[PDB]
Design an enzyme around this catalytic site. Sequence first.
Site, PDB file in Angstrom:
ATOM      1  CG  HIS A  79      -2.362  -0.749   0.977  1.00  0.00           C
ATOM      2  ND1 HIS A  79      -2.051  -1.799   0.360  1.00  0.00           N
ATOM      3  CD2 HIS A  79      -3.325  -0.678   1.050  1.00  0.00           C
ATOM      4  CE1 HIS A  79      -3.340  -2.614   0.298  1.00  0.00           C
ATOM      5  NE2 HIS A  79      -4.048  -1.788   0.750  1.00  0.00           N
ATOM      6  CG  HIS A 242      -3.942 -11.564  -2.740  1.00  0.00           C
ATOM      7  ND1 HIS A 242      -4.700 -11.165  -3.809  1.00  0.00           N
ATOM      8  CD2 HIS A 242      -3.495 -10.530  -2.142  1.00  0.00           C
ATOM      9  CE1 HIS A 242      -4.965  -9.991  -3.540  1.00  0.00           C
ATOM     10  NE2 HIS A 242      -4.359  -9.491  -2.581  1.00  0.00           N
TER      11      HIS A 242
HETATM   12  C1  HEM Z   1      -5.878  -5.950  -8.124  1.00  0.00           C
HETATM   13  C2  HEM Z   1      -5.201  -5.556  -6.761  1.00  0.00           C
HETATM   14  C3  HEM Z   1      -5.340  -5.880  -5.435  1.00  0.00           C
HETATM   15  C4  HEM Z   1      -6.477  -5.733  -4.589  1.00  0.00           C
HETATM   16  C5  HEM Z   1      -7.822  -5.433  -5.001  1.00  0.00           C
HETATM   17  C6  HEM Z   1      -5.946  -6.354  -3.527  1.00  0.00           C
HETATM   18  C7  HEM Z   1      -6.554  -6.659  -2.393  1.00  0.00           C
HETATM   19  C8  HEM Z   1      -6.806  -6.911  -0.866  1.00  0.00           C
HETATM   20  C9  HEM Z   1      -7.608  -6.770  -0.011  1.00  0.00           C
HETATM   21  C10 HEM Z   1      -8.934  -6.485  -0.062  1.00  0.00           C
HETATM   22  C11 HEM Z   1      -7.165  -7.516   1.211  1.00  0.00           C
HETATM   23  C12 HEM Z   1      -7.528  -7.854   2.738  1.00  0.00           C
HETATM   24  C13 HEM Z   1      -7.492  -6.689   3.503  1.00  0.00           C
HETATM   25  C14 HEM Z   1      -7.852  -7.078   4.943  1.00  0.00           C
HETATM   26  O1  HEM Z   1      -9.132  -7.409   5.140  1.00  0.00           O
HETATM   27  O2  HEM Z   1      -7.224  -7.341   5.754  1.00  0.00           O
HETATM   28  C15 HEM Z   1      -5.778  -7.572   0.699  1.00  0.00           C
HETATM   29  C16 HEM Z   1      -4.466  -8.113   1.481  1.00  0.00           C
HETATM   30  C17 HEM Z   1      -3.084  -8.712   1.068  1.00  0.00           C
HETATM   31  N1  HEM Z   1      -2.956  -8.152  -0.200  1.00  0.00           N
HETATM   32 FE1  HEM Z   1      -3.709  -7.589  -1.658  1.00  0.00          FE
HETATM   33  N2  HEM Z   1      -4.573  -6.671  -3.362  1.00  0.00           N
HETATM   34  C18 HEM Z   1      -4.380  -6.380  -4.522  1.00  0.00           C
HETATM   35  C19 HEM Z   1      -2.913  -6.709  -4.365  1.00  0.00           C
HETATM   36  C20 HEM Z   1      -1.576  -6.967  -4.076  1.00  0.00           C
HETATM   37  C21 HEM Z   1      -0.342  -6.911  -4.150  1.00  0.00           C
HETATM   38  C22 HEM Z   1       0.265  -6.090  -5.680  1.00  0.00           C
HETATM   39  C23 HEM Z   1       0.238  -7.333  -3.188  1.00  0.00           C
HETATM   40  C24 HEM Z   1       1.996  -7.524  -2.723  1.00  0.00           C
HETATM   41  C25 HEM Z   1       2.873  -8.089  -3.849  1.00  0.00           C
HETATM   42  C26 HEM Z   1      -0.523  -7.591  -2.087  1.00  0.00           C
HETATM   43  C27 HEM Z   1      -0.684  -8.434  -0.870  1.00  0.00           C
HETATM   44  C28 HEM Z   1      -1.680  -8.779   0.275  1.00  0.00           C
HETATM   45  C29 HEM Z   1      -0.950  -9.270   1.391  1.00  0.00           C
HETATM   46  C30 HEM Z   1       0.072  -9.895   1.630  1.00  0.00           C
HETATM   47  C31 HEM Z   1      -2.341  -9.485   1.909  1.00  0.00           C
HETATM   48  C32 HEM Z   1      -2.751 -10.007   3.410  1.00  0.00           C
HETATM   49  C33 HEM Z   1      -2.559  -9.267   4.502  1.00  0.00           C
HETATM   50  C34 HEM Z   1      -2.675  -9.772   5.853  1.00  0.00           C
HETATM   51  O3  HEM Z   1      -2.632 -11.119   5.999  1.00  0.00           O
HETATM   52  O4  HEM Z   1      -2.960  -9.172   6.720  1.00  0.00           O
HETATM   53  N3  HEM Z   1      -1.968  -7.229  -2.515  1.00  0.00           N
HETATM   54  N4  HEM Z   1      -5.615  -7.336  -0.511  1.00  0.00           N
END
Ligand code: HEM
Lengths: 714, 710
Positions: A79, A242
């Site tokens: 972010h 993810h």
């Molecule tokens: C089309 C793009 C994306 C969308 C719409 C998106 C979406 C989201 C959402 C809605 C969450 C969960 C927030 C929460 O409730 O705790 C999340 C978390 C996560 N996102 Fe993505 N994301 C995208 C891309 C990316 C990219 C590019 C990365 C990193 C290289 C990343 C990695 C993560 C990680 C590791 C988590 C999990 C956090 C945790 O375990 O607390 N994301 N994302």
Amino acid sequence: KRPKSNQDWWPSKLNLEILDQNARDVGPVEDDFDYAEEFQKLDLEAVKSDLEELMTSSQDWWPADYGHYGPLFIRMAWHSAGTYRTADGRGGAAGGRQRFAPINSWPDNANLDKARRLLLPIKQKYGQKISWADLMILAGNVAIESMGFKTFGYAGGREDAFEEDKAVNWGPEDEFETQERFDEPGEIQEGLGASVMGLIYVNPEGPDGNPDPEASAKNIRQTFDRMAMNDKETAALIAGGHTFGKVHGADDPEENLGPEPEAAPIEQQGLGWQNKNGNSKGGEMITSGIEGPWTQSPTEWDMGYINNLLDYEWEPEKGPGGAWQWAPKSEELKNSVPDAHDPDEKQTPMMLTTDIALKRDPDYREVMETFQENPMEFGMNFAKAWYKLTHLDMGPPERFLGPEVPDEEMIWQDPLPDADYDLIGDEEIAELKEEILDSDLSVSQLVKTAWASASTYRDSDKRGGANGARLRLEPQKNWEVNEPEQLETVLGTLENIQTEFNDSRSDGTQVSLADLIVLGGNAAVEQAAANAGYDVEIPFEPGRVDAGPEHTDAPSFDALKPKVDGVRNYIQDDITRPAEEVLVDNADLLNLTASELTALIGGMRSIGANYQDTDLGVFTDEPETLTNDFFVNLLDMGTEWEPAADSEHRYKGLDRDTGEVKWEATRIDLIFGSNDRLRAISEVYGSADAEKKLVHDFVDTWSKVMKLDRFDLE
Amino acid sequence: KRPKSNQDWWPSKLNLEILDQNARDVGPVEDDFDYAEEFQKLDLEAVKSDLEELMTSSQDWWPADYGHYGPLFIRMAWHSAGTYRTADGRGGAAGGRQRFAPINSWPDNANLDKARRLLLPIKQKYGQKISWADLMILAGNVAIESMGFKTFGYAGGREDAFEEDKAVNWGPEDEFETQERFDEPGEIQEGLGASVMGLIYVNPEGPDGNPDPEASAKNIRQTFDRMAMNDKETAALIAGGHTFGKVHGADDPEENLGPEPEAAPIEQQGLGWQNKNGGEMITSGIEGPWTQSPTEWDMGYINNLLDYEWEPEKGPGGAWQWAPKSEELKNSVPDAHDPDEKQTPMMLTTDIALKRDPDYREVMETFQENPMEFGMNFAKAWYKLTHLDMGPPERFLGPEVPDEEMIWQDPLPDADYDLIGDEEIAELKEEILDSDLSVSQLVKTAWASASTYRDSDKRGGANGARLRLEPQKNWEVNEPEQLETVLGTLENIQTEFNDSRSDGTQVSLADLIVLGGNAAVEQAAANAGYDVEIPFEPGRVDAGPEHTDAPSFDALKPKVDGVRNYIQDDITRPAEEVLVDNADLLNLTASELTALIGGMRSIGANYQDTDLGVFTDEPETLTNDFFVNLLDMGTEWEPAADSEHRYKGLDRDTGEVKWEATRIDLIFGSNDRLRAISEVYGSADAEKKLVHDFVDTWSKVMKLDRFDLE
Ligand code: HEM
Ligand code: HEM
């Protein structure tokens, strides 16, 4: 009550506040020390070691999922860098502005206040030796590394900002989580990196909140493209990211989470989104409102995401938080993942609409299939994409600090070649300046060309500038604003000088075209000042090199193309915003203050360096003679202004009595006599004993701009 | 469109932008060069001569009424100085801010854009030697003198601002010419100098637009009182001012004038109110001269007002105005432009207010009985009006400054003795530290002395030791009982020293107060292991009751004091907002304020010696303990039960009640920008920097009213 703002009374008032940010460095930091120096004193491995330990040291006020904070920190880093826009280079992780409003309170950054809070002890321990900006990205790297994936590299050097970037226009919406920037997915209004106000890229539930994966892919592709990423990079980043952690949505966030940071009570001390059941409860944690992990082992690098996504069929449903998410039609994945906090419970994987988009979209699907078939390829692409994502707003390789900087320099760093020759000395500098002035090139041509070269610099992502002489390469050499035809003529003459200079040397000394362009500009300004009776000497820094097509990602430079250029009084007939607003926006990229911009423009009009050599704003009878004639004539009440007939940007200055046309100009010129603050500056420069001051201020600003990309002096 | 602001998303967000104004000096002027020096080079008489000529040099784009711009310039100057409020010292003519929004676009300032434009050539001719601020007042003076009335004096020295004063709260209204600040005339809400948004003092037609002169008088009296003027001064200024010129309302302003300057097209080049259609000028919407000879000083206004009966009517511009009942005044005045036309005198509801209100009437009758008395009341009131935000007499520059010093200048006596030297200073500091006065007593007293300074109108400060005089010696925030103890001890030190000397050297109590404070800070630093030497400027004098208008000093009384963690129970705004407001008056930046409060809490100098915000177990020891403990996530904060601005800090794991604090302390760990500053000072290797920044800010505050050095 509230001291109100002129902004409230007059919504269209020029936002000079953006230029005021360049007039000083807010914060307690002393302007005698550079961060680069302090970072060099940092023991990077010691910080990484501490970050490593923190990863599995769960703090009760915000329990770590699966006993590992790693995934949370990756999201934090994602972010932080994720707000970047190629259009203006703003947004991004270089200043760590995720810490300030409005970003710190965007719904997409929910609970990242807690993530950053977890790093406070480490930040305090190393103090000035490591910025929040560098620390946040490093935390993401350590997270990834600790979970079984070596990163491609890491560079420090990101100086912390102490306030938000007032120049960033995040969108027209008047409410977070709403959009008024696109009717059809993939057709977002230009100049924005996200599809929804308050979100990083796109809506995780799908466009407009509808779980339509095919439509979602259109926005994902466009937004990521506006963040400098192609299909392969986008798929690698989303899938790699993810592969870790989960989404949080134990209940509806709209009713179970307290106010965002900026609106939270003082006792929360900077934190926000207070959970009704208490933040301590891991099982009640709510962030996005979507619930569930993507893989069976959320804290280990593997092919779990790609495998779960491609090998199984998914269905859209409403999750526990009331948001759109996808569940597997199979029962093989039911309760296949352990609960993040309850040791005696399990969970079922879930996929976001945006994840399904990668499988539904033809092109993304091809990439994902290839990744699933070639794990090494997936790893290679994600590693490089992650490095790119987190370093794209740091500028050229010269700015990358530390022992983890790769030896390989990437094209997006806009690399520069070494100077395999001795640099010119003072005698040669004087010699070349004289030779340039003795050519058939005029002061205007020389000033116009030097400006064309340096004007592409932008302080947002440190791209652009005169170093490299990319003005002579694609695409700049063919930009309408640079007058290709005329440009070639000037560059040919300078190239001949370079040729003759180099061939006459017998010591190994050589001069670059990049330096001659700037040197010719300086000489021209000095001559113009001389014609006005002033003896000024512009300091000159030799050493710029000539970059080649091999060091240039041509298409990526199109984002530096100015739609409005004040120095050259150039206004593109496609602009939506008033010309003066674009002028201020561009002035900010050059780090100019309101006074510097005023002196620059007014001084320039005296010299006369307009596009197509028009007389717009050239309020003087002695062109190429640096004086304050622009201000004197602009402020003369003997003249009355009015829009020119059948003109989109032209205005006529008429003799109030005779009706005779005395001058012609654009809004770029007239804004200095209209805006209340700019007019106050104009009056100073237009006074009887202010000519020498204007000349010196103009010269200082010119010199400043010419050296913006010389980070060797930084 | 345009980039939205955090202010729009979060209306209640702390406005640190007002403090950022103290960080940099926008404008193209060098930071070194001082205006006083440049004004000193000015040939004032030469400027006045040019202004004199300008008066009768009609410019085609804004033809002079009666062929004389004098009245227009008088109005320009009255409006420039007229926005002043005693409550915070803001507003006023000192920065020439009438030139910037929002003031430049208030309906009450209609067509002054033209008035100021007429002065542009003179401004250009003299350049930096005379500021717009000084020139606008000088223009008013020359106008008055050219029309037959000698002014009481004139001082230069007003440094031009290059932007608006963001710290001013002009009112709650969301629309100009509307009011949401008074339910009954004479009962305007506190802190406002006018009864209507966008007006200088009051509505010329009457309160809420009703032509009720008795009611109007109540708002006139309260607003002028809030601008430091009493009944005699108010009546003298209005009657003296309206002895000149006319009001303009050839037709309704709402449909005959173009947009105000800020909203006008770019080609208008800063001008506004472009007439959409002999003088068809439209400004206020009210039309007509007050007197028979509008460009001559005489008793015309007072005689016309008092010798005839008046009746209210709607003028040609659709506004309330009064006409005389007698046909004797009918067409007794020449038209301002049409030479073959006449006009009947008129009065505004606000003028009739001076006749209908019992107290104002008595004053006006007195004026009519003796023109010489009326004349001097006006001359002195005009001088006061236009110089009340310039500070003490030392700041008044130029050949026209009166030898006589007025009480509103907060004058200071001369030091009829030799100043102490380095050895005396060192000795006195030791003597102070050897007394039974604590570090906290000394810091608190020095702060109490210096904290009254406000950069807005340059009043207050430690010079003069007015802390020891009424009303300051009795302010609740200064803890009268405790203050007496400190002053008594310091007074005895002064007596002993002055008697011991033989060469005629003496030390003022004013200097001892600051010296004691510095000594204490240096001691606090020493306790923490740091050797700091605070520079000391000897020379402050001891002012007496005769140099002090006691009631006028109550405007400097704090409602909130961050250094002493004092909060009045009657405050309306959140404490942190008042804190920021007050910090601005001390010319502090966000970082300086942060260093000051945080450093101060380690020393411990609270009102009533509370432990509020004193996050340290080693008081009177200058450290960065405040920040370290404030930022410790091991502690959780909650509002104190039944408290107003109090909070409790509890250990998250042990449940131990570790600290007590106010919103003043906690905002530094809550606001996004202040927290970033706090993190810097709370870092492992930042204590020395904090100590130094605290000392530099402390020294800055102690020397704010030392203009002799300016
Ligand atoms: C089309 C793009 C994306 C969308 C719409 C998106 C979406 C989201 C959402 C809605 C969450 C969960 C927030 C929460 O409730 O705790 C999340 C978390 C996560 N996102 Fe993505 N994301 C995208 C891309 C990316 C990219 C590019 C990365 C990193 C290289 C990343 C990695 C993560 C990680 C590791 C988590 C999990 C956090 C945790 O375990 O607390 N994301 N994302
Ligand atoms: C709060 C009490 C006062 C009110 C309501 C008030 C009101 C007004 C209005 C409505 C105008 C006409 C604007 C126009 O249409 O051109 C005017 C003009 C004038 N005022 Fe006053 N005023 C007051 C106080 C003062 C004071 C204190 C002075 C200066 C000692 C002054 C001097 C003038 C002058 C000389 C003009 C005539 C301008 C010209 O001829 O262009 N006024 N006033």
